[PDB]
Structures are given as C-alpha cells and as structure tokens.
C-alpha cells in the first residue's frame, strides 16, 4: 500500500458527494445530472422526463436555474460575479415552456443583486442599483417601488456588509408573503459609519481604493427599517412602515430576524445594542385603514442574566399549524438549552425536551410532528442526531430515527424536508463514508438511496490512513474533550511529536465526528506526528456555566485549557517534550499567538494565520456581544489587557509564523501590521508571508502555496 | 348601488376648482365617503378621506394643505375643493364608499360609478 501525498490533499483527489433535493411539490424534485439537463422527479409514479435540454443553457451559458411554482417559466442565471461571502450578481433571462421560445418584450436589466418568484403563481420581484422592482408578468414593464437607493450610502431589499457577515448570514433581505399578497423589505440606512479603506492592485497601471461601510467597536450602527407594501395595487397607500415598540426604541438597536406567519401576520425580533435582551413582537393587519399595528400585549421578552441572549446567533421561533403558539430554543432553569411551547406569555412556558443534552436546531413542525437536532446519544457531545416527536397525541412519544440505521459509519446527520413533510431526505456527514438517503416520512422506511460513494471507497482501498479517536480529560472539575489522530504502526513504547490544532472561537466546536481527508491526514500518514484537537470552556453544545465562563473575558481560559491538554498528553508517555506546535485561524490564530507567548516553554513552533491582534480593530455586533462596550465606565480595562501586542517580549525563545492576506475585508490587515510593528520594537524574530489581493479565504493556487509552505515550516521544527 | 360625479375640467396653471358627487341606492348619512383619482396609465391613488358625521377628515400627503373636503347629508352630495393647482394632477377622480360607519374607513375597491376627468395644462 501507499501513503497520503500533498498533491492528493492540494488537489480534489478524495472528495464526497452530496445530494439535495430542490423540492418543489411534496412528492416531488428537481436535479441537475452530470449533462447539463436539469431532470424532474416524481416518486409515486417513479417516472423522470428531462424538463429543461442542455442545448438552451448552452445556448445563453445559463450556470444556474430557477422554476416558478406555476412551472410555465424558467429563469436562467449566467455571468456569475462574486461580491462578498455570500451576495453576487448575475444576467437573468427568461425562457417559456409553453411555447419553447424565450419570453420578449420587456428585458430585465443588468446585473441583478437579488432575484425572486412568488409562491404562488409567476409574478417576480428583483432588485437593481439598490432599489426594489415589480413585475406582474414577463412581459409587462415594471412598478418601482423604492427610490432613494443609493451605492453605498442605502440599501433596499438586500443587507449591507455587517447584517450580511455577523447578523443575517444571507444575501436578500425581502420576503414574501405565504400566498404572494405582500412584500416585506427593509431599508438600511449608512451615512454617519466610518468606512474601511484598502488597496486593490489588479491589472492596471495605478491601484484602486476600495471603501467598505464598516462598524468597528463602539462605533455608529447603520439605522433599520421595515416595510410592507401590497401587490395587487401598489399605489393605493404606498409602502407602510411597522411600529417600533418602545421598550426597544430608546436607546440604537438590531434587527434580528423576520418571518411570516400568515397573510395578515408578522413576527419581528429585535435586539439591543446591549446584547442580554431580546423582543420578540407579532404585528397584525388592519383592513380598516390599510395598517399594520404591533400590540403590547404581543411582547415577549427574553432576558439573560449571567450572559448574551442566545448563542451565535438568536434563535428563530418556528409557529405551529394554528398560527397562535409557537416553538423557540433557549436556557433552562439548570443551564441546558431546551425547546419551550410558547402561547400566551413568557411565564408560561412548557418543558417538552429536559436532560443534562443540549438540542441545536429545529428543521420541521407540522399538525402532529416536529423535528430537531440533539447529542443526547451515550453522552457523547459530538454527535448529530435527529429525533421524532409528537404533538397532540393522546399518547405521547420521541423516537430516534438516526440512532441504529448505520452505527459504526454514520453518527452525523442534516435533514432537507418537503411540503407538508411528506417526504424528506437524510445526508450523513461521518464518520464514515458519506452518504445520502431519501425516506418514506411517516413510516420512515428508506427508500432510494441517492447517494453512496462508491467511487471514493474504491479509490481508498490502497491508501492506509491514521487512526482518529474521540475521549476525554477532567481536570479540576473542568470536562476538556480531545479528538487525537495517530499515524498507521503506532507503538506506544517510543516518542513521537505532537501537533495542536486549535480554533477555540465562542459559541463553536473543533471536535466532531465528521468524515474529512485533509492536510492533517497527510502528516499524520506521511510524516508520523500525533495531531490533537482540544475543546474546554467557552465553547458550545455542553451546557451554559462551560459557554458563559468566557464573558468578557476573551483569552485566558482557551490558553489555559490548551496547556493543561498538553501537560496531559506529555505525562501520558508517548509524546517529545522536545518537540510540541501548535496553529489555528482566524481566531486559532488570536489562541495560537498567545499560548506560544505564555512563558511555560511547552511550545516550540507556531503558525498563525489571519489573526485578530486586538479586539477594537473587528465588527462592532461580534465584538459587544462578547465582550461589552470600550468605555471607560463598562471594560476599557479589559481591552488593553487582551492584546498580542502586549506578549511581544515573550516570543523571545520561539518560532513564529505569521500570514495573511492583503485584500481582506472580514480581518483586516491592519492587525497583522500591528503585530509585525510590536514585534520589530521588541527586537523579536519571526517569519511571515502575504498573499496579494486575496481575500479571508484564499482560494485558489494560495491555498497550495500556503499549506506547502506550512508543511515545509513544520518539518524544519520538527527535524 | 349608483354614483355620480360631475365638474371640473380644463384649467390654467395656478387656478382652483371644485367638484361635487351624489350617490344613491344605499343608506346615506351613515357612511365614510372617501376620494381616489386614477391618473392616464398609472394605478388608483388615495386623494381624501371624509367622516360620516363630517368631523374629522385626512388628506394625503400630496394634497396636504391645498385640497377641501365637506359633504351635506340633506341633499346627499360631497364636495371637493382643490386649490392652488400644479401641472400634475391630470387624472380621473372617483368617489368611493367605505363598508364602516363607526368611524373613518378608507374603501378598497367597493363600489365605484364613472369617474370625472381633470386636466392641468399651460
């Protein structure tokens, strides 16, 4: 047999599959095959018909496509052009089925932001130069809605950078009606934010500024507002803006998150700039005057005492069948988050989930069923499972379906459901081979199995890769879980290096059972190193004291944890003392940087790569919700205590790597600048490698330079 | 359910008109009246609101200031003064009856008659 090689890993040589149903009934779906025909499927009848040739997107280089819910228009997506992580724009064009020719009369400008059918019937609402527009057929011109849309400056139906990167995490904020009646949109308002500015070189003689609206710490929070607007006349009142309620409006403030609940029914959660309090607010519809009123006794208040409200994120309530009760996530009594019914107040809330577990997220609820995600299986708190409960039963009941179909392969798990959750399907992730499924969804009995990787066991069948498993460390009555890969041979009579790989990020988690082939493969495989990863305190899924023992006390308690992990293993007896690395990203390598300068001597390489040097140079919501505000009255202690710059005297007897990317807009340059600056006044050497025009990811041929050359820095440490 | 709308007409910028509309079929003095106009390819828009009881009325927010509403229930007629006129009001106004006499009630689309046309111009 052969070992791993780097051009397996820089190249996708062992790579999964994945299969998503792109539902658009409840029985059934469409796909795209491996011949650029985009094939519907049915499963009573079982019979598949290519609705869409190759020949018509070969004709326009169509890279995407989108059906309306009426299945007599199609729209093909082409010119792709990345913006941020998540927006871009593209060319939308227009194809009948009917007739077989594509529509005319009205063409849609070019680029579009953002794009969107309604659900029921063919009616579209996209978005250009920041303003919102309406279209009642294909071929009829379109309605402006808004009109103050502005580059930069204001932003209609789509988030700017900090709602789309820290708040929302999509690329559209408008939404439909349930029955296609209304259009609720939100106007951003950034005049008065300080903006970012850096350099991009290109192909041209002289560089270019770009300049971001960017919040940093402490700094001006853009201004939100929401609309809803009807459709069928949009010019009897124009657009009408929800009431603020007024224990919110008193002070700057977020907007957390929107969800329709009927056609005459709203639901707005809201978020103070001190981020321990959130409302949750149902506005209804008045035919009367044309109005929207937000009630006071339709206030629901959620408060968190020793900590932020939620986790990452907020969670977001999902509404039952009568559209008066609802279902959201949070703490418990004891400190675990818990699935609580919600139906009049607050106060009133029902346990229906309890235990030590926790409970991630919640996919479907339906008329007798509701799905959710837990780790409750054997204590083991890296595992995804699906779970089965009932709801208005005269007997109740919870089954696993996910516990015993595939043990020793898959204990991971991601549901994709259907319309009236008639069918759904199960994607398992690892341990094993990932797989793919599709079940009955009320008998749930498999029935096709839509994805296998055959090609991939085949290909693995020469290949002798490490061995990985998952276990635990209590020290001091602090519970560390550690997952340790050992290369192939591995006798414990002789010494080995050890490499650490450390995120430590709040409100995350570094040690799951998922199914990856990566760089660490490769030098476990090849090389004969041990790699460790460690999660402690501050991170999630095990309970609250473990998530809030962080609060704004960022970096102290990972680097802690990491060195306790390390004496272990060192005391455990197969490790060099001699010869112990660590590395992370992005926020590994803030952890990274610091445990390398904490003076005990462990250490003796380290790699940081996109760090955050300090914690006033990053976005205002992230920053706040874990820390608090740089004032003098609240932590402005803490904020000049925490900072790399602050260890550059410790890094005198160490190897430090340093990198980053010129053109990043999530962490900008300027926090490796520092470092490097504190580092050259301390008269302290180190190495360092930047990558031009490049952003947070570095994709492309940087990634093969920067694993290349990091794997180069590692055998010279170790040697 | 019938209504009937009558005046206005061509006018020189900066002038002033009136108009007035009478309905029947229906049991006046205990309705809401209000006032739309369609202009020449473009949707219905809401001009004007008037009280059963003639009390309280509400004006848009481009015919704040400059336009009148008053309505007499023993002859069953509404009247519509619209001062100080600039070159965009071209259009075919309405009248229209609400469904709520308990207090003011803009109608959506109930009952609708034939419509008057009014045209500014130089």
């Known amino acids: 047999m052969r070992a791993l090689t780097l051009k397996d890993i820089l190249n996708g040589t062992f790579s999964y599959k994945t299969f998503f149903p792109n539902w658009i009934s409840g029985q059934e779906y469409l796909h795209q095959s491996a011949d650029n025909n985009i094939v519907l499927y049915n499963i009573e009848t079982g019979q598949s018909y290519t609705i869409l040739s190759n020949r018509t997107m070969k004709s326009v280089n169509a890279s995407n496509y989108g059906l309306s819910p009426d299945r007599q228009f199609v729209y093909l997506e082409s010119d792709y052009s990345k913006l941020w992580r998540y927006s871009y724009t593209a060319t939308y064009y227009i194809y009948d089925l009917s007739n077989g020719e594509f529509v005319r009369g009205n063409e849609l400008p070019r680029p579009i932001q953002y794009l969107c059918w309604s659900p029921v019937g063919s009616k579209l609402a996209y978005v250009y130069q920041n303003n919102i527009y309406l279209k009642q057929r294909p071929g009829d011109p379109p309605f402006q809605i808004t009109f103050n849309g502005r580059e930069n400056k204001i932003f209609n139906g789509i988030p700017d950078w900090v709602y789309e990167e820290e708040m929302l995490a999509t690329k559209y904020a408008l939404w439909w009606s349930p029955n296609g009646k209304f259009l609720a949109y939100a106007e951003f308002n950034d005049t008065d934010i300080p903006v970012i500015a850096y350099s991009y070189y290109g192909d041209e003689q002289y560089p270019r500024t770009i300049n971001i609206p960017y919040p940093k710490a402490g700094a001006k929070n853009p201004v939100v507002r929401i609309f809803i607007i009807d459709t069928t006349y949009p010019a009897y009142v124009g657009p009408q803006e929800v009431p603020v309620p007024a224990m919110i409006a008193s002070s700057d403030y977020y907007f957390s998150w929107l969800t329709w609940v009927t056609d005459e029914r709203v639901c707005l959660q809201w978020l103070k700039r001190v981020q321990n309090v959130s409302v949750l607010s149902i506005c209804d519809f008045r035919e009367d005057w044309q109005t929207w009123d937000c009630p006071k006794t339709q206030e629901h208040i959620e408060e968190s005492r020793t900590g932020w409200a939620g986790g990452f994120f907020v969670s977001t309530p999902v509404f039952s069948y009568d559209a008066i009760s609802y279902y959201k996530i949070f703490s418990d009594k004891d400190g675990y988050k818990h699935i609580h019914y919600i139906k009049d107040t607050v106060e009133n809330a029902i346990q229906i989930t309890s235990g030590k577990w926790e409970a991630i997220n919640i996919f479907r609820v339906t008329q007798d069923s509701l799905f959710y995600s837990s780790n409750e299986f054997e204590e083991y708190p890296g595992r995804r499972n699906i779970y089965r409960i009932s709801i208005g039963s005269y007997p109740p009941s919870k089954k696993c379906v996910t516990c015993h179909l595939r043990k020793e392969r898959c204990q991971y798990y991601t549901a994709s459901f259907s319309d009236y959750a008639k069918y759904y399907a199960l994607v398992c992730y690892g341990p094993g081979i990932p797989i793919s499924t599709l079940h009955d969804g009320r008998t749930d009995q498999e029935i096709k199995i839509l994805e296998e990787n055959k090609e991939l066991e085949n290909a693995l069948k020469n290949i002798q890769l490490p061995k990985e498993e998952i276990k635990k460390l209590e020290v001091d009555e602090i519970t560390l879980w550690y997952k340790m890969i050992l290369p192939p041979q591995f006798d414990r009579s002789k010494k080995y290096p050890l490499l650490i790989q450390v995120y430590g990020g709040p409100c995350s988690q570094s040690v799951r059972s998922v199914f990856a082939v990566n760089w660490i493969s490769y030098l476990a495989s090849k090389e004969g190193m041990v790699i460790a990863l460690v999660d402690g305190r501050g991170t999630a899924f095990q309970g609250d004291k473990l998530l809030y023992a962080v609060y704004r006390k960022l970096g102290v308690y990972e680097v802690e944890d990491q060195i306790t992990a390390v004496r272990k293993f060192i005391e455990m007896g197969f490790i060099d003392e001699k010869r112990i690395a660590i590395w992370g990203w992005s926020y590994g390598g803030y952890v990274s940087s610091l445990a390398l300068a904490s003076g005990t001597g462990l250490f003796k390489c380290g790699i940081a790569v996109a760090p955050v040097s300090s914690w006033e140079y990053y976005a205002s919501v992230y920053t706040e919700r874990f820390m608090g505000l740089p004032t003098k009255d609240d932590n402005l202690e803490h904020y000049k205590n925490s900072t790399v710059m602050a260890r550059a005297e410790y890094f005198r007897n160490v190897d430090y790597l340093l990198i980053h990317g010129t053109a990043d807009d999530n962490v900008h340059f300027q926090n490796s600048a520092q470092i490097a600056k504190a580092l050259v006044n301390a008269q302290v050497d180190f190495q360092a490698m930047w990558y031009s025009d490049q952003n947070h990811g570095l994709s492309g041929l940087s990634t093969n330079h920067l694993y290349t050359h990091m794997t180069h820095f590692l055998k010279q440490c170790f040697s | 359910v019938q209504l009937v709308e009558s005046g206005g007409g061509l006018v020189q910028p900066g002038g002033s008109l009136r108009l007035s509309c009478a309905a029947s079929?229906?049991?006046?003095?205990?309705?809401?009246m209000s006032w739309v106009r369609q202009a020449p390819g473009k949707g219905l828009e809401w001009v004007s609101a008037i009280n059963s009881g003639g009390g309280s009325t509400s004006y848009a927010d481009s015919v704040k200031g400059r336009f009148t509403i008053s309505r007499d229930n023993a002859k069953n007629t509404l009247y519509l003064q619209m001062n100080s006129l600039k070159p965009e009001d071209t259009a075919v106004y309405y009248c229209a009856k609400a469904r709520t006499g308990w207090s003011l009630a803009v109608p959506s689309f109930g009952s609708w008659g034939q419509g008057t046309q009014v045209t500014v111009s130089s």
């Open positions: 079929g229906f049991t006046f003095s205990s309705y809401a």
